[PDB]
Amino acid sequence: QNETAKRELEEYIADKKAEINPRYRPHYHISPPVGWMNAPNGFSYYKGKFHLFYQFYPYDSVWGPMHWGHVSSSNLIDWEHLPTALIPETEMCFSGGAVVHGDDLVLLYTGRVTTDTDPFYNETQYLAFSNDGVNFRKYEGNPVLSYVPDNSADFRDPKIWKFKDHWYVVIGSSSNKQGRVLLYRSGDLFNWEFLSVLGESDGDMGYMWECPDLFELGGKTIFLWSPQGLEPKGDRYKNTYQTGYYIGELDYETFEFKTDKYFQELDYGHDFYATQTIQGDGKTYLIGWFNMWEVPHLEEEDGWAGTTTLVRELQLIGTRITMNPLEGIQDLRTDSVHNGDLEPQQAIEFGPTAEIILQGCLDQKIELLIQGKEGGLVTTVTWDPEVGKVIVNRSGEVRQVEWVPIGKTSWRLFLDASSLELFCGEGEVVFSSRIFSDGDWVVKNSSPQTLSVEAYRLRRSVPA
């Protein structure tokens, strides 16, 4: 590693840290120490700790020359910052995965380099290694994988896993302005054999397929990815770009992904894009970037942008991936703020953090009004039984979906200094939206019915 380049960045961060307005900084969501965060990267388990990286531009609250930020956790709730894992050189350090080989945590990441031809960039897969889980050195012979079908300039966001005697990777690409994902495999992590175009847009599924993922859940293969170029369709695909999944079966003989290509959005909120998953304890954990491309970031002017979501546990119930907060998220709970009846127009007061478990009768309207103690911008969460929809109105911008409850009719709502995550029922309908208002959260019952509300303040689990 370049000791000069590193030390200079560590001291830029340690100094720039004092200029970070804390007003919107999350208490219990992963945020960059300073500057810009986008897609989470290389979700891994190495030496008794979950490791997570992320697309990181230290020097400003907007996108720029891509670094890998780095955090670790015992419980997937509390996270410590580590030194910047990857600093760009000739290549920007674009998204990718991480896997444990020997004593080593191995990062497989896309290196984007400039060119002087129409695309004006090229994408290949770079290796970096660590034995201490702190310092990362790039492989002398990078890139280890350069071949992409139709010589497409788009070739990014490898998700690597081990099955039998091979590492497999799914990688995002385009061709004739159609999104696609490519399956490769290696015996040694250095030499990569192309297997198949796992899926491709027929025209209606966008021009680029970012942050692909592939894993088993509920006895099925999930292809989870971030397509760009979907048209809004009724209530769906309203965000700048989408994250969603196909259900099917990956055949490890034919390397064919057999699916009906029934697309579903994972998260119905305003600010959900680009996911990572890991499997352990017989569970499937997922985390996403808690922002959206080409829309205002109200925290930008405070010298930072972006958080992750809460880590969610996945299940496949029928045809639906449910998301729920971690079983032990209740460890965040400090003060018990409310229990039982919350009458019409009655309000609950928090600090910057809130957990609310609410139930009403689904025969009548449910509505929460969420706003700062000192007023400012409003977010409303509504059950409208006329249309059978959950509606998150974030400062006038609507996200809504039909909700057919699996079982539980209760909602679990998590507020952080500048975020909202609504888990409806058993997690079949989830909204993740960034929210901003003036001061400590006040939540008012706007419903024409009394709600049952269990409410807590939540402690910090991440740095300022």
Ligand X SMILES: OC[C@H]1O[C@@](CO)(O[C@H]2O[C@H](CO)[C@@H](O)[C@H](O)[C@H]2O)[C@@H](O)[C@@H]1O
Which residue ranges make up the site for ligand X (CB under 6 A)? 38-39, 55, 63, 66, 94-95, 110, 156-157, 210-211, 228, 274, 293
User: Counting beta carbons within 10 angstroms of the beta carbon of residue 74, is it exposed (0 to 12), middle (13 to 18) or buried (19 or more)?
Assistant: exposed
Cβ proximity to ligand X: between 38 and 277 the closer is 38
What does the block give as tokens for 367?
A: 């509505």
User: Counting beta carbons within 10 angstroms of the beta carbon of residue 410, is it exposed (0 to 12), middle (13 to 18) or buried (19 or more)?
Assistant: middle
Q: Rounded to the nearest whole angstrom, what is the least distance from the CB of residue 306 to ligand X in the complex?
A: 11
Q: Rounded to the nearest whole angstrom, what is the least distance from the CB of residue 157 to ligand X in the complex?
A: 5
Cβ proximity to ligand X: between 60 and 440 the closer is 60
The answer to whether the CB of 160 falls within 8 A of the CB of 141 is: no
The answer to whether the CB of 279 falls within 8 A of the CB of 215 is: yes
Cis amide linkage into residue 385, ω under 30° from 0: no
Q: Rounded to the nearest whole angstrom, what is the least distance from the CB of residue 294 to ligand X in the complex?
A: 9
Q: Provide the H-helix boundaries in 207-282.
A: none
Cβ proximity to ligand X: between 41 and 382 the closer is 41
Cβ proximity to ligand X: between 209 and 257 the closer is 209
Cβ proximity to ligand X: between 228 and 452 the closer is 228
Instruction: Tell me the residue nearest to ligand X as measured from the CB.
Output: 95
Tell me how far apart the alpha carbons of residues 452 and 464 are, in angstroms, rounded to a whole number: 33
Cβ proximity to ligand X: between 112 and 412 the closer is 112
Tell me how far apart the alpha carbons of residues 88 and 66 are, in angstroms, rounded to a whole number: 6
Name which of 229, 249, 245, 248 is nearest 237 in CA terms. Answer: 229
How far are the Cα atoms of 125, 138, 260, 329 from residue 98, in angstroms, in the given order?
12, 13, 30, 25
The answer to whether the CB of 68 falls within 8 A of the CB of 85 is: yes
Q: Rounded to the nearest whole angstrom, what is the least distance from the CB of residue 99 to ligand X in the complex?
A: 18
The answer to whether the CB of 289 falls within 8 A of the CB of 69 is: no
C-alpha torsion angle, residues 295, 298, 302, 308 (rounded to 10): -70
Q: Rounded to the nearest whole angstrom, what is the least distance from the CB of residue 210 to ligand X in the complex?
A: 4
How far are the Cα atoms of 122, 190, 273 from residue 293, in angstroms, in the given order?
22, 33, 9
Cβ proximity to ligand X: between 238 and 365 the closer is 238
Q: Rounded to the nearest whole angstrom, what is the least distance from the CB of residue 293 to ligand X in the complex?
A: 6
Q: Rounded to the nearest whole angstrom, what is the least distance from the CB of residue 242 to ligand X in the complex?
A: 11
Cβ proximity to ligand X: between 247 and 286 the closer is 286
Q: Rounded to the nearest whole angstrom, what is the least distance from the CB of residue 116 to ligand X in the complex?
A: 19
DSSP 399: E
Cβ proximity to ligand X: between 39 and 52 the closer is 39
Q: Rounded to the nearest whole angstrom, what is the least distance from the CB of residue 174 to ligand X in the complex?
A: 11
